[PDB]
Ligand binder design. Structure first.
Ligand SMILES: Cc1cc2nc3c(=O)[nH]c(=O)nc-3n(C[C@H](O)[C@H](O)[C@H](O)CO)c2cc1C
Ligand SMILES: COC1=C(OC)C(=O)C(CC=C(C)C)=C(C)C1=O
Ligand code: FES
Lengths: 250, 32, 202, 412, 198, 446
């Protein structure tokens, strides 16, 4: 009884474990590249690069995009494994992130990683754009976006929200191509270099350097978008980094 | 293949521990 | 052959046996997740029944559940690893419900009720049949939820949304959980209208 | 009329050529004349009250709210139109919308000096099509279910239809109103067997369908005033943004006083704005014994306690924390739901002790959703639907205590 | 205590396991015929969930999480087999304990244990705990709160179904069909808490 | 004193004058077979047979040993039967004065009589059927005992006779009957009355309790709920005051006492008054020449709980002490449900009638509406004085859930206890019939 019970359990466990372990280890490398290619495809899209096949995405990402670490406090580049840096995981660790106060936490993120990752879009050997990952709390969930900025450090080249959970008809319009097209050509800062991008409720004026139309019937999500850019363009975000970029960096 | 070997050992040991606990509990609780 | 098609309408796992309800509510927001979940449940149920029937004469009764869940979980782990490697986008949408295939009442229900007392080949057929009935509900519910909540089928635009210059305003409630309860309930009303023998007595 | 009804009676009785329409015939014949039936068993005499009179008193009790709502809806629309447009631009707007030029065709005016007749007429053009669509679509479902199950049409749909029409924005599309009433009548009421056999409020279940299925047409700043191109927040939305100081009517530039909200000079749902009109209607049905004062008392107790608790706690970020109880009373659909929707006897608790707990739960939930839920400025519909789920549970607690007393022979 | 109290309220009303994540529906729809039967099942779910979540949290953090035993070895692929194995063992042990020393408890809780041995509600709660990376104290609060929320939903459904003794459901919807519609209407009410960022 | 607040007194016109007068000569009487709960008759007589007074007519199969005896001396003329051959009535035409005699005692020794001797004399005389048990409102088994016997010395029914007038005429018989009941019971005797003085028994186990308030203050079910709660293991007996008088006459004179005093009343009665009559008297002959013209309904018992006395049922009931006559309300009114209702009575305040407090109503048999589902506007709680949840109990009766109804107190109730609930029901449910079906199901499975 006991001998038969243990023999069956041990034999069954060994066979199951071997199949499970082989599948988990053999497929592990392909699993981690699928996660990478999902984000790499999104960064290529916001940068304005056409890529359809998985191989095409990999070759274009390596050729055109160079990830680099940036320290938020100083605005200087930091040496590290940029392609494998996880900013979200670093934001949840006390040794690699700072807790924000009520005054500073405009976007309601409650924490901020010490060092972030930016993506330099290079045409050959000269940087043409910089991709800044920003995030801020919406009405229902945290919203993550990529914003493409020209080398002048003021002009927006494109925007793409790649992770949001707002209502599809109200708030989910952050992914609407028509709304995203409005961000092209806008200026992030005024002549005093203060953050000046504004989400205008009821529709921005047609000729405007800083105004972007708000989401119809979605004032709360629009406030989340406005707070997101207010924080990340401030001194606590990419403020000093964009100040150095506009001075002749990159 | 250290991960595979560790996976095989831990998978067997976890199940064996669960089986032994149930058998010990049944022997010490269920009347006979 | 009749054993394959019996769990579709005569003995439907969800409409009659009240098994597998949890996944039917969650994953049916899209046809792509409903189709993948259908294949995964059909794959796991058929193989779990097959392997359990092979060793049905040696499973100790004291730890019978542990032995059965060791086979069921191992198959689901392999399915989860494969989905992460080849269907990463769909696997991310399925979230925790890939793991919940282990606790799906259909998989354990058929393994205990049928596989323990049947030959492996009929057990494999029984698992395929119950997967077809389970999938029939998932695809039917997923069809209405996706078409009426997004105007799309498998991501292909069938009804042009007004936000994209179309004419159809998507129904927000179809993307919310209460619609899944309603659709299943009315689906049962339709099945038992054409199958009066399934009507519960008062 | 009476002779015609008697003559055609044999056609709808079994064996006649119109047997399948028997349900419709009794709905019409009994509508005009009493059935003329005598008792068959003990209690050879009966009380004069029946379901028809109970439903008709509630239906009449909302008439003051209905008429003021049409007057207020027109007044808000006309004021906003003259705030935005003038001269030829206003003339083009009037010609482009059939509500506006129909009002001017029937002797009314869209000018800023329009009288109460023009304002009520403009509100009528927005409310009557909604009420007609709700009545016809809902009535078809009620009759169809009764014909299939071979039962007489029970009363209560007149209350459901008029209440649903009064709790929607004046700009609601007609096709959405048809879908909303269909969900409320069929899913919430008819699949359970009709009047008296459901557990969920039918009118609010229909409104919850529109709330979540098509939130763009039942929320925001574009649906509460029936003026084309006019964007304006309401008092609950404005208070959530900037507290008491933010209550400004942009159509006229005047602050929203407490008396303005109490009388009903505010935008919102058609029949919810006037708390005074709802009080008059509620007083008549509470006095008649149709509406339960225990439920109404419980709602007030719940709202007063929780709102006072929020005021004492205070918040330097959420302005909804400092709203007093009397501001909660006169804003939103609190008064409408408390007087005419929380008092639905079928959806409420069946015990007097349960009714107090049922009412308190509604009052607590309504204030909670207003204050600590940022997505929704109001929570009365959600509060009542939530309390409909626990209404049987309150009864279960009460009866189990009663059974325990009985098993002890009531103390012998 | 505000952090733990906030988590407790979040797991009961904001993220109710039965009416916001809809796990365990099979036993939820079936056993909800009677209030006392549902009340007994709900307590059993609370006890199993309050024990299973903290134990699996200890196992995951000490063994299965990356770099737990040996640096560079990730055994997270064993999560599924380990979690259900612990749950399947603890439930069976409770049957052997209650039926032996506490016959009154075995009638009250033991008779419902076989149903929830592999129920989706227990496994789903453990999976959510791993995703959210709770601590041990948070695991106890989350496990207890999830069970209370699950018990609250099934008892509320049981009271509704007992009230429905007077209903006139059509034969096609009688039984399972009307129960699905009832639970869908209950989901609408619980959406009142949706949007509360607690 | 126990005061009842919840309840309703019907202000129906035609109240009787509380003066006893001689009634019409009654030429035939009958015993109604359907008014006894669970009674399966074994006939001991045939058509044409001549029967003596207090001679057994039929026996009960389901209650062995119980004898139903003739109230008068005469000839069996007809044995009416209905659907499934149910015994409707056994009619005897009055002719002669032959009778069966029994033992008679003195008033001093009545309280010391043996219980078996008392039971034997009551059963043989047929007076044992006056007792009804609670629960189930059945005639008690001859071998059973009760620790509580309730004497209904009051009547709050509409148009009911005042018990004070009848008891004062038969004070000696009433006290003698109480002494017999005191020896019969193993516990106590509860004489439930109003504040008016009544003749008193000197026995220590006979207790007078005063009940005040509107209907149903006078019902035996209300008295039991407040003095001796009943259940499966606590069975009480009830008996009305006029039957207590008959018990006293039986043990004092040795002869069955079948005289009754019933109130003849109602809107269509020309002279409402108390009339002397006999048990089971033909209501067609009693009511002859007493009613205004038109289609009328004659009711044995009260309007709230009584038997439609038509055809084979046109005889005074065993437990009925009044005869009510009403018009048949067949008129159809145009928008009658929406009228202000100056002359319409209601427990609610939806009509102008309640604004006139001193108004009496010529109530007819109209239903005032069609049958509908129950919508609980709270009318039941206003008329139910017992510690029950009326709305939830009534839903169980409509749903047929006998087990839940028992837990909610259905065993403590009779049909008359739910008469007010039937009256005020907006959905026009008849809860008396539903309760009896639940009680029949409970007994069958017991
Ligand atoms: C005082 C009162 C309030 C009512 N309130 C509502 C209501 O808010 N919504 C509704 O659909 N029906 C309402 N009704 C009608 C009816 O009672 C209700 O639809 C029931 O749910 C029908 O079973 C009400 C009826 C009364 C007498
Ligand atoms: C107010 O009471 C009511 C009626 O008459 C008085 C109805 O005819 C009807 C029936 C209506 C239709 C459309 C058949 C209802 C529902 C009702 O509530
Ligand atoms: S499928 Fe989840 S409990 Fe059955």
């Amino acid at each position: 009884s006991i001998k038969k019970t243990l023999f069956v359990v041990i034999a069954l466990s060994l066979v199951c474990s071997i199949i499970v372990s082989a599948a988990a280890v053999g497929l592990r490398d392909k699993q981690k590249e699928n996660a990478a290619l999902d984000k790499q495809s999104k960064i290529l899209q916001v940068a304005g690069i056409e890529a359809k096949g998985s191989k095409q995405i990999v070759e274009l990402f390596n050729k055109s995009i160079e990830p680099r670490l940036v320290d938020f406090n100083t605005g200087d580049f930091v040496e590290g494994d940029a392609a494998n840096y996880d900013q979200r995981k670093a934001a949840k660790e006390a040794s690699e992130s700072i807790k924000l106060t009520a005054e500073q936490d405009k976007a309601k993120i409650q924490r901020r990683a010490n060092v972030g990752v930016v993506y330099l879009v290079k045409d050959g050997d000269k940087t043409s754009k910089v991709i800044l990952p920003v995030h801020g709390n919406g009405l229902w969930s945290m919203m993550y976006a990529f914003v493409a900025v020209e080398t002048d450090g003021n002009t927006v080249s494109g925007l793409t929200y790649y992770e949001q959970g707002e209502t599809p008809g109200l708030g989910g319009e952050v992914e609407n191509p028509a709304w995203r097209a409005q961000w092209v050509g806008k200026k992030l800062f005024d002549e005093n270099h203060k953050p000046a991008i504004k989400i205008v409720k009821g529709g921005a004026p047609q000729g405007s350097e800083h105004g972007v139309d708000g989401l119809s019937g979605a004032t709360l999500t629009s406030n989340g978008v406005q707070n997101t850019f207010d924080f990340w363009l401030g001194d606590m975000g990419f403020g000093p980094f964009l100040t150095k970029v506009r001075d002749g960096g990159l | 293949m250290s991960t595979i070997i560790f996976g095989v050992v831990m998978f067997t040991l976890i199940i064996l521990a669960l089986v032994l606990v149930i058998l010990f509990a049944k022997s010490k609780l269920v009347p006979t | 052959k009749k054993s394959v098609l019996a769990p579709v309408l005569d003995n439907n796992p969800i409409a009659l046996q009240v098994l597998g309800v949890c996944s039917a509510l969650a994953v049916t927001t899209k046809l792509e997740t409903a189709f993948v979940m259908t294949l995964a449940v059909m794959f796991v149920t058929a193989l779990s029944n097959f392997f359990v029937s092979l060793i049905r004469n040696h499973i100790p009764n004291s730890v019978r559940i542990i032995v059965q869940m060791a086979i069921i979980a191992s198959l689901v782990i392999v399915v989860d690893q494969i989905l992460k490697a080849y269907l990463y986008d769909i696997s991310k949408q399925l979230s925790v419900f890939v793991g919940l295939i282990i606790t799906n009442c259909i998989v354990m229900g058929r393994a205990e009720a049928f596989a323990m007392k049947s030959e492996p080949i009929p057990s494999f057929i029984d698992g395929i049949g119950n997967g077809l009935g389970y999938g029939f509900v998932l695809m039917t519910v997923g069809f209405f939820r996706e078409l009426l909540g997004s105007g799309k089928l498998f991501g292909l635009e069938v009804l042009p949304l007004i936000s994209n210059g179309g004419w159809y305003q998507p129904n927000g409630l179809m993307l919310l959980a209460p619609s899944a309860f309603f659709l299943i309930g009315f689906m049962i009303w339709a099945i038992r209208t054409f199958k009066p023998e399934q009507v519960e007595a008062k | 009329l009476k002779k015609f009804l008697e003559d055609i009676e044999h056609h709808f009785e079994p064996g006649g050529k119109h047997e399948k329409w028997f349900a419709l015939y009794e709905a019409a014949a009994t509508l005009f004349y009493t059935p003329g039936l005598v008792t068959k068993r003990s209690s050879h005499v009966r009380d004069s009250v029946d379901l028809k009179r109970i439903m008709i008193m509630v239906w009449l009790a909302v008439f003051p709210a209905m008429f003021w709502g049409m007057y207020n809806a027109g007044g808000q629309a006309i004021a906003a139109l003259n705030h935005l447009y003038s001269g030829d631009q206003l003339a083009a707007i009037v010609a482009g919308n059939w509500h506006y030029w129909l009002t001017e065709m029937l002797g009314g005016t869209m000018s800023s000096d329009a009288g109460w007749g023009s304002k009520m007429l403009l509100g009528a053009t927005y409310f009557l099509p909604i009420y007609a669509t709700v009545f016809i679509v809902g009535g078809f479902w009620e009759v169809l279910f009764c014909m299939v199950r071979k039962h007489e049409v029970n009363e209560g749909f007149f209350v459901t239809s008029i209440l649903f029409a009064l709790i929607v924005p004046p700009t609601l599309p007609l096709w959405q109103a048809a879908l909303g009433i269909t969900f409320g009548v069929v899913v919430a009421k008819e699949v359970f067997g009709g009047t008296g056999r459901n557990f969920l409020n039918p009118a609010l279940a229909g409104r919850a369908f529109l709330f979540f299925a098509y939130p763009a047409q039942i929320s925001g700043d574009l649906v509460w005033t029936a003026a084309d191109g006019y964007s304006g927040a309401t008092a609950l939305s404005q208070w959530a943004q900037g507290g008491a100081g933010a209550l400004i009517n942009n159509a006229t530039g005047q602050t929203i006083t407490w008396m303005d909200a109490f009388i009903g000079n505010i935008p919102g749902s058609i029949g919810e704005v006037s708390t005074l009109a709802l009080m008059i209607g509620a007083a008549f049905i509470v006095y008649m014994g149709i509406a339960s004062w225990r439920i109404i008392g419980g709602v007030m107790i719940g709202m007063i306690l929780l709102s006072t608790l929020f005021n004492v706690i205070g918040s330097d970020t959420n302005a909804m924390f400092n709203m007093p109880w009397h501001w909660h009373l006169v804003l939103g659909g609190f008064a409408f739901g408390m007087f005419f929707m929380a008092t639905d006897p079928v959806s409420a608790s069946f015990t007097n002790s349960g009714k107090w707990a049922y009412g308190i739960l509604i009052g607590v939930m309504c204030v909670l959703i207003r204050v600590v839920n940022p997505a929704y400025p109001e929570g009365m519909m959600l509060a009542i639907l939530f309390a409909n789920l626990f209404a049987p549970l309150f009864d279960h607690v009460v009866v189990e205590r009663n059974i325990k007393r009985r098993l002890a022979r009531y103390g012998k | 205590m505000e952090h733990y109290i906030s988590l407790l309220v979040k797991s009961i009303f904001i993220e109710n396991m039965a009416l916001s994540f809809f796990l365990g529906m099979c036993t939820f729809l079936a056993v909800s015929k009677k209030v006392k039967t549902s009340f007994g099942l709900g307590i059993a779910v609370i006890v199993v969930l309050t024990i299973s979540v903290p134990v699996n949290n200890l196992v995951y953090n000490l063994v299965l999480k990356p770099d737990a035993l040996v640096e560079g070895v990730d055994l997270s692929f064993l999560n599924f087999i380990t979690f259900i194995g612990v749950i399947a063992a603890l439930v069976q042990i409770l049957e052997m304990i209650l039926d032996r020393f506490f016959p009154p408890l075995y009638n009250a809780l033991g008779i419902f244990l076989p149903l929830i041995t592999v129920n989706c509600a227990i496994f789903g709660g453990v999976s959510f705990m791993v995703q959210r990376d709770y601590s041990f104290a948070e695991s106890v609060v989350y496990g207890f709160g999830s069970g209370v929320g699950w018990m609250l939903a099934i008892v509320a459904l049981a009271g509704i179904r007992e009230k429905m003794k007077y209903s006139d459901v059509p034969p096609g919807l009688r039984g399972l069909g009307i129960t699905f519609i009832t639970a869908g209407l209950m989901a609408l009410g619980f959406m009142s808490f949706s949007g509360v960022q607690l | 004193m126990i005061t009842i607040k919840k309840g309703l007194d019907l202000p129906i016109a035609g109240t009787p004058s509380q003066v006893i007068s001689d009634g019409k000569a009654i030429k035939k009487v009958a015993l109604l077979g359907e008014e006894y709960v669970g009674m399966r008759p074994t006939m001991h007589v045939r058509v044409g047979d001549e029967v003596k007074k207090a001679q057994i007519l039929f026996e009960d199969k389901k209650n062995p040993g119980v004898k139903f005896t003739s109230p008068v001396s005469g000839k069996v003329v007809e044995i009416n039967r209905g659907a499934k051959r149910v015994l409707q009535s056994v009619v005897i035409e009055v002719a002669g004065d032959d009778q069966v005699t029994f033992d008679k005692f003195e008033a001093n020794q009545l309280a010391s009589l043996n219980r078996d001797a008392i039971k034997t004399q009551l059963v043989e005389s047929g007076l044992w059927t006056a007792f009804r048990t609670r629960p189930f409102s059945k005639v008690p088994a001859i071998d059973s005992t009760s620790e509580a016997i309730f004497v209904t010395a009051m009547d709050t029914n509409p148009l009911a006779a005042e018990p004070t007038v009848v008891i004062n005429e038969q004070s000696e018989a009433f006290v003698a009957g109480l002494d017999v009941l005191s020896a019969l019971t193993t516990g106590k005797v509860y004489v439930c009355k109003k504040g008016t003085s009544l003749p008193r028994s000197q026995q220590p186990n006979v207790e007078e309790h005063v009940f005040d308030g509107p209907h149903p203050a006078g019902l035996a079910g209300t008295h039991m709920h407040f003095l001796y709660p009943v259940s499966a293991d606590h069975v009480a007996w009830s008996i009305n005051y006029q039957d207590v008088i008959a018990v006293g006459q039986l043990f004092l004179t040795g002869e069955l006492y079948t005289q009754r005093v019933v109130s003849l009343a109602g809107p269509v009665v020309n002279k409402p008054r108390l009339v002397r009559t006999v048990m089971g008297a033909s209501l067609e002959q009693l009511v002859d020449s007493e009613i205004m013209p038109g289609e009328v309904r004659i009711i044995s018992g009260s309007v709230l709980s009584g038997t439609k006395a038509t055809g084979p049922h046109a005889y005074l009931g065993r437990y009925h002490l009044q005869v009510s006559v009403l018009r048949e309300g067949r008129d159809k009114e145009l928008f009658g449900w929406a009228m202000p209702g100056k002359n319409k009575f209601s427990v609610t305040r939806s009509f102008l009638g309640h604004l006139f407090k001193g108004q009496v109503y010529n109530m007819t048999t109209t239903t005032n509406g069609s049958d509908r589902s129950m919508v609980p506007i709270g009318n039941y709680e206003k008329v139910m004085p017992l510690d029950m949840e009326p709305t939830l109990l009534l839903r169980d009766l409509c749903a047929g859930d006998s087990d839940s109804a028992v837990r909610l107190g259905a065993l403590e109730l009779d049909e008359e206890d739910l008469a007010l609930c039937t009256f005020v029901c907006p959905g026009k449910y008849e809860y008396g019939q539903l309760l009896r079906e639940c009680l029949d199901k409970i007994e069958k499975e017991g």
